[PDB]
Amino acid sequence: MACKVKAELEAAFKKLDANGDGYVTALELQTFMVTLDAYKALSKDKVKEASAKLIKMADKNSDGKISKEEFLNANAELLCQLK
């Protein structure tokens, strides 16, 4: 009952830059967010063209980021497309 659902952002964040030293994390998400703070570059696939290279440094089978990241990273990505 305590609290609820929403802090899911704390997972990716706390995992994205909990210590940041040499592990692929949001450290790039910032660039992603800065490069497309509004995912205004997905659909076509201009998002993977940059993530694919960034994912090759940690994202090979789902290790880089798995949580709010996928939430926010998939939020617009999975939500992208429409009128």
UniProtKB/Swiss-Prot annotation:
Annotated PROSITE patterns: EF_HAND_1, EF_HAND_2
Compartments where located: Cytoplasm
Example of a GO cellular component annotation carried by this entry: cytoplasm
Domain EF-hand: from-to ranges: 4-39, 46-81
SMART domains in the cross-refs: EFh
Principal localisation: cytoplasm
Binding site for Ca(2+) 1: 17, 19, 21, 23, 28
One of the record's GO molecular function terms: calcium ion binding
Keywords: Calcium, Cytoplasm, Metal-binding, Repeat
Expression across tissues: Selectively expressed in a small group of neurons.
Keyword Metal-binding listed: yes
Amino acids binding Ca(2+) 2: 59, 61, 63, 65, 70
InterPro entries: EF-hand-dom_pair, EF_Hand_1_Ca_BS, EF_hand_dom
SUPFAM superfamilies registered for this protein in UniProt: EF-hand (SSF47473)
Pfam families (alphabetical): EF-hand_7 (PF13499)
Keyword check for Metal-binding: yes
Function statement: May function as a trigger protein which interacts with a larger protein. May mediate calcium-dependent signal transduction events in the growth cones and axons of a small group of sensory neurons which fasciculate in a single axon tract.
Name of protein: Calsensin
Lineage: Eukaryota, Metazoa, Spiralia, Lophotrochozoa, Annelida
